[PDB]
Point group: D2
Chain length 491, copies 4
């Protein structure tokens, strides 16, 4: 056994006693020793005041989540595409942490609420930590970075009531066409995954990979579930929201405690700069996919999730990912949404966790060290602050090693831009309508789902939603209208 | 009509554009102007970095809640008991704010979860802000202050899984007998109110009120709903949690907008020092009630809630109550739980909100000013910091006016105490069993509710639970074991 | 009379009393009522716990400073150069706040320390707050943004000792040539001004100003003290440093309380894009000035400082400036140092003061309001959070106005390039000229030598040697004169 | 790997410490054409290093902001187990690792080491029974004996709320209105207010504490640490010149002495006093303005300590170290000294703000020699210690056996508000102090010289009050200060 102590190592005799000077007991039928509590009762203050400070801000988005440790293995040679050390040589293994999450829901909300799902993985490489911060859909609601807070605002609560507002929700989406593609995924049954074990991961954005000769290619990354894609119907997700809000969390934890380790197979699509020039859409458009016919998937690795964390708060809660955490061989593209993400994530980490959040164990570059003599001091500096090491570069008395050193071309002035709609923007949602209804029940599900949601909205706004979905296939607005009034008929 | 600006007031022409230098477009079939985002895009960084910082910590407890403004009225003369200015003269109106809450649930959790409910009221008087930080039960789970974090921890999530753990839950309560009284409430249908409009508020603790002669008396405050006490059945509460996790929030906001303003009538129980000496229990025991036959309720006022906040975060989320915020005429008793609360609430405020949280509007002493020249500086000092006023008392150049009988008596040494069980502790739980089953279904409900929750616990711990309830009435344990078996049979 | 209360408005009878239960007095020749302090003593805990939290971090740089309110007046029509609202019409007056500062010293350090001086002024205009964050020199130590923390670190304290380290100090400067120009200023007597009233302000950087047709010109801004430029000698500065560390602060506060209000006349230098293409140096180089011969100053305004703050902490300490706080008519240039500043200052403010620091009175846009429905919540939200105004643009139930929206601008060609400014022979030319400019005044040149010599005599020999080489890059005699005087200083031990 | 590789905070290798990414302006037409353009959001190296620079600073301590530290060894040299059961005092020859911080009081971070102030003398002992802080001053007494006066006192010692200048009016207005300061002020104005170095001053517990022997018999104590380097002071003039020449003089003195191996050391003594002996005294053991006379209570030698090791990083160790008088071990308790009593609360409270909620996880602050085990205290910001993984967060958890280490004054009356009231004896000891100086030539004139220079900047009316005040100790003093006040006014 060990000895129960205060935060400073002073042993404690009883966990439950507090100091008091008792009232005089003369006259009392019942006289337990009661009196005012004392400032000197250190055990009391020291435990209370720590209790008082247990909480940190939840993430602005993706607040609700579960995570696990595991292993990534390189299974094919792709060194002709990508020079990254963790991909160096076949059969090489890298430790990973993956956090799954919903989007809008706050910390106590339901695992089975309707949302995209977050799929973020930290790779502890010899070249630093690489964060693959992916969603469970290959596309997204926006392609203008600054629209994010607007969008996310209308996904959450009314500033006054603190209730979800169907009016906001649809006012935003219908006013911004480009959201159509992702909204259709959201209201399809894909919006309601059974478990994290049964969903895919997609980079969404295009990134840029470099081989060791300095030749680069556009890439899109797919992680595909060896457990297969299974989804829930609205009724079922709804019931589970009430019976078990932590369903997915529980699912993933138990799977792992049993030995039923879920795993994913990892592919990429690649494309050259010349190839990109001939497309009807931009590689920088987060609302688009690369058709599988024209750009096939190339296998490169897999990963398996096999180890639960030891304490949830310390690891799952405090872990911090950013797309700007990358390694040599992988750069980000000019996808403007991704570009802004490069700044946000570290910025928000500094607020949610604190200036030195990389010093928290899960966030440490465990496989490679770090040596950054220029970043010093700041709150809660626990890593030794490099002792006496000089804090500027080329110090006479500290020799440091630096690593060995066509691309895209730019023309024009500095220009303000908001992505402008063209005809092709409706084409990909059109095809997705066709992709559903290659399965019985899928099209009818979308309609029934969009309809239950939209029926609480005011009429003038329901109308705009019909118009909106009809931009994909005219039948959809009609079918949704037809279902909305069936629901109103009942009561 | 307003003009859309930066945080610094500079006007903005388009809310959606961001600055880039575009890629050369020779050869592209589709050529939108895309390029890397720039540091100089102030509108971009300004709105993102703020977005990155929207969240503050949720309250360690009572995180999930709803609030409203109202009016309190003095309806009878109680100046013989209490000298407080806001009870001065009959007919006197005081503006209030009330926040209702559940206890253990985090911010996205369900309104209709089984819990006590918080009932906290801020009174803006001529003598300062008075916080009556009440529960919807006249008792509580604990009477030793330092047990609170232990208790609350077992009420929440497992350190490793982040799941609720029925093992913890019952392992704590059964190990700590004194919880039995409150747990019987919690598992009665009273653990599940229909709305906040249909519940009572109770001071729980005993306070001390003083009249203008300096004569004091122990008090217990009752707030009784003019809307009557209505509860939900477990089946319903579980459904509501799934269909509408914001049921109680919506209920309150809608009532008020409709003009169905809820109200409560206010009563006190009073008791002299002499009287207290003759009781089989302590006035300082939070697990005890004052029987109504022995100490009758005296009406003194009513309050009505009639005004929704304008911004939920700014008012309802940022408001800070503390039992140590009192006025002349009301002091705290030696109730050691209450004692410890006097420290915690301001302590936690300084962490949740910030050192100067009393400068946030809802938290201001609106009716009376403040003038506290010793309290200066600190982060986010927004109230002017008293300009040039000297910052010590009896400064030569700053003249200040200050405000213009037998009390309790103490003897002995400083003594460490943990409240020790006596036979009477089980007596009041016994009576509550008799109080239930004066209504058909109440008793069977308690058993049903305790059995459903406990069936997921391991056998050895189910066993302790039976023991535990039987300490109130022997049939109860046996009835729970009966239903536990029945439920296990089906599965 | 006002009534002494707690933070919560409860009246307090005695400022000095604390609650206790007394020890039994029996047997005591002296028995004052003493006992353990109580948790329920709210007056105690409330005032102590606030006292516990009085401090916030100091600025990473320019920590030590003094501020005042004033008035800016447009005195000439420059609407042909700049469309900014506060420069609209002749005679227009704008409320300002200026904060003067030293660079490297911490909060307790001396006002008469050798350092550049900061000169930051916040203008409350009808189109938002404009910060003109200037120094007292038209140039600076660096022209590569990311070098700043390196440079600053070496100006400050050794990671182990917490002492200044003359080895670091010179190690950095000497390894980075471009600092020579500004280092010469620093060690001439201009690194030691007499007061803040007797120094000039310069934009340092090149900015871009736009008239209402959309025609833009590169600018450099000059604030010239009507009280003239007066400097101290080393020995005087050092003595004052021991006698009155707050010399400059006192001086400014007293001048204004007398009515001896200090003032500055404002000029600009302008230059067209076409003119810039012909120069031997870059408009984007913070280590260069624009010769007065070729680009003459144009007078446009004046400001006077005439009002002390009411509470120093609340106003001088908490005020936050940022070069990215600008108004229509004025944009930053591609000066990479300036560029990085655009990000830094608001970033640091969020740390030093907090997420919602603009809500602090001095930092508010007082003359124009603000309406930014996208920015909500965050810690210490005190401005009402816009009540129930929808928090997204083009909300169906919230009608909004935007400001009314061209000519040839700068043009860009190439790939994304990593660049660290590379030395050319012209970099030494302007330091060479500054040696000639000193020595048109007796004693100026010999001062720089003495000042560099006394500082560098605590450095190890091997590093002293690099310093002579360094100054000798401007004019050879300077190393030799410094080596000579360092050796004659060593002579005594 | 040696030489170390230069990386970002996340471990990614960097090629050049000084480069930043841009897209260059077109160079056609330029006589000089370096590649200049707008900086980019994607430049991680830039944002990463700037944003951390932006956050280097934390609040300085409210008082004692200017300091220097070193590590050393304390040795038990005598048997005092009849007085104190403290483990680190257990057996003769036992060595304990300590860290000591020396500081001035009111000065801020950039201020002079040789300013006139008391000097702090704080030492952390890492014992097997937890961390012990002996938070001492270089004088055996202090300015106040009423706790809540501290902020008033400290405010007037510092800067004017409007000017930010020191205000001699304030300074003395406070001191003269509060008589009990006279004793300490004499110390302060004697040459002892200006030590030559930290090596050449003593440390004194100031307060009375209570030590327990293993039988549980206690005794009041006072601790003295006496410099083996002797007590050497400076003259005001010297103190003022050094202030300009070398504001870091004491820091440099300490560092250099240690680096040379001229380790400074202190011998440790205690005075003891029984409860009964305390009853017969003309003053209280609880009065910090009082010393125990050496004739009646002789010093008993018990140990020594030596400071032999400079810190590796100043910020990480010296700056972030946190001491509190409430950090104690078994065998040592605090007394009822009300100033000490309030200090028990203050120091932890301030720590949580200066450093943060989990400051005890910072290395220098860890109980290094004893572990800790406090399963109740979890989560909270920058939680870096592993948060005890899966260990239950409540006591007497069915699934986690814990061990609890196994183990006077009397009180009578009501709760009473007290401000200590002046009696005739208060002036007596300052009177003795005047006699103690002037046993050495130049000491009495000095005090006079020093008080005069400081006071000659105050307004006349307040100078008068200062004369009266010193005269309360000995009438000549007032008149001698008035005398040298003019000798100065006439030079
Ligand atoms: C009511 C009276 C006092 C109060 C409320 C008080 C409070 C404080 C506070 C808030 C700090 C800053 C600590 C930190 O920021 O980590 C501090 C530091 C300090 N105090 Fe006091 N103090 C009082 C009197 C005293 C006395 C009587 C002594 C001498 C016995 C003393 C010695 C020190 C020392 C040496 C430090 C700095 C320790 C370090 O370097 O961390 N103080 N005190």
């Amino acid at each position: 056994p060990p000895v129960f102590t205060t935060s400073q190592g002073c042993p404690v005799s009883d966990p439950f006693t507090t100091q008091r000077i008792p009232l005089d007991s003369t006259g009392y039928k019942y006289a337990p020793p009661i009196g005012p509590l004392l400032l000197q009762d250190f055990k009391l203050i020291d435990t209370l005041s720590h209790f008082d400070r247990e909480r940190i801000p939840e993430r602005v988005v993706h607040a609700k989540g579960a995570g696990a440790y595991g292993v990534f293995e390189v299974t094919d040679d792709i060194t002709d595409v990508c020079s990254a050390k963790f991909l160096d040589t076949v059969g090489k293994k890298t430790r990973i942490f993956t956090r799954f999450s919903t989007v809008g829901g706050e910390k106590g909300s339901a695992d089975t609420a309707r949302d995209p799902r977050g799929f973020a993985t930290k790779f502890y490489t010899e070249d630093g930590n690489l964060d693959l911060v992916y969603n469970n859909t290959p596309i997204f609601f926006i392609r203008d970075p600054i629209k994010f807070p607007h969008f996310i605002h209308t996904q959450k609560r009314n500033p006054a009531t603190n209730l979800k507002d169907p009016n906001m929700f649809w006012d935003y989406l219908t006013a911004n066409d480009e959201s159509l593609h992702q909204v259709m995924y959201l209201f399809s049954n894909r919006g309601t995954p059974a478990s994290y074990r049964t969903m895919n991961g997609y980079s969404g954005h295009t990134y840029k990979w470099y081989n060791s000769k300095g030749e680069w290619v556009y890439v899109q990354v797919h992680f595909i579930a060896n457990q297969g894609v299974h989804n829930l119907l609205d009724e079922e997700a709804g019931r589970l929201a009430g019976e078990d809000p932590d369903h997915s969390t529980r699912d993933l934890w138990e799977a792992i405690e049993k030995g039923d380790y879920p795993s994913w197979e990892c592919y990429i699509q690649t494309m050259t700069l010349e190839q990109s020039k001939k497309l009807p859409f931009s590689v920088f458009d987060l609302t688009k996919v690369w058709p599988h016919k024209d750009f096939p998937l190339r296998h490169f690795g897999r990963f398996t999730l096999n180890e639960n964390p030891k304490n949830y708060y310390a690891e799952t809660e405090q872990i911090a990912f950013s797309p700007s955490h990358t390694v040599p061989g992988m750069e980000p593209s000019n996808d403007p949404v991704l570009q802004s993400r490069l700044f946000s994530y570290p910025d928000t980490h500094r607020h949610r966790l604190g200036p030195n959040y990389h010093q928290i164990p899960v966030n440490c570059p465990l496989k490679s060290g770090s040596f950054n003599p220029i970043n010093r001091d700041g709150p809660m500096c626990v890593d030794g602050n490099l002792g006496g090491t000089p804090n500027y570069a080329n110090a006479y008395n500290c020799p440091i090693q630096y690593a060995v050193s066509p691309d895209e071309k730019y023309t024009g002035e500095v220009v303000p831009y908001h992505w402008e709609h063209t005809d092709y923007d409706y084409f990909q949602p059109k095809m997705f309508w066709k992709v559903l209804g290659r399965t019985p029940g899928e099209q009818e599900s979308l309609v029934k789902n969009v309809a239950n949601h939209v029926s609480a909205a005011d009429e003038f706004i329901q109308d705009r939603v019909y118009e909106y979905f009809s931009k994909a296939e005219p039948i959809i607005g009609d079918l949704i209208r037809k279902k909305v009034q069936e629901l109103k008929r009942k009561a």
